[PDB]
Subunit: 30 residues, 6 copies
C-alpha cells in the first residue's frame, strides 16, 4: 500500500545517509 511505500523510501533514505557518513569519515581521515 501507500504506507509500505513510505517505509521503503525511508529505507532508501537511511541507506544514502549511511553512505554520507562513510564519506564524511573518509574526509576526516584525510
Amino acid at each position: 500500500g501507500e504506507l509500505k511505500a513510505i517505509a521503503q523510501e525511508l529505507k532508501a533514505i537511511a541507506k544514502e545517509l549511511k553512505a554520507i557518513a562513510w564519506e564524511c569519515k573518509a574526509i576526516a581521515q584525510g
Copy 2:
C-alpha cells in the same frame, strides 16, 4: 492522494541525499 504525495517527496529526498554522498566522496578524494 496525500499519502502518495508524501512517498513522492521522500523519493526526491533520497535523490538529493544520493547527490550529497557523491559530492562528499569527491571531497574525500581531494
Copy 3:
C-alpha cells in the same frame, strides 16, 4: 489537511537538501 501539511514540509526538506548538494559540489570543486 494535516497530511498535506506533512507533504509540504517534506517539499521544504527536499529544497534544502538540493541546496546542500549544490554547496557540496562547490566544496568538491574547490
Copy 4:
C-alpha cells in the same frame, strides 16, 4: 494531534537543514 506534531517536527528538520546549507556555503566560499 500527533499528525500536527509530526508536521511541526518536520518544520524543525527543514530549519536545521537550512542552517546546514548556510554553513556549507561558507565552507565552499573558503574553498
Copy 5:
C-alpha cells in the same frame, strides 16, 4: 501510540541535524 513514536523519532532526527549544523559551522569558522 505509533504516531507518537514517529513524532519522537523525528525529534531525535532534528536534534542530530542541529549537531551537524554546529559541526559544519565549526568547519566553516576554521
Copy 6:
C-alpha cells in the same frame, strides 16, 4: 504494522545522522 515499520526506519535514519555528526566533528577538529 507498517506504522511501526516507519518508526523503525526513522530510528535508523537518526542513527546514521548521529554518525554524520560524529564524523563532521572529526573534520572540524582538523
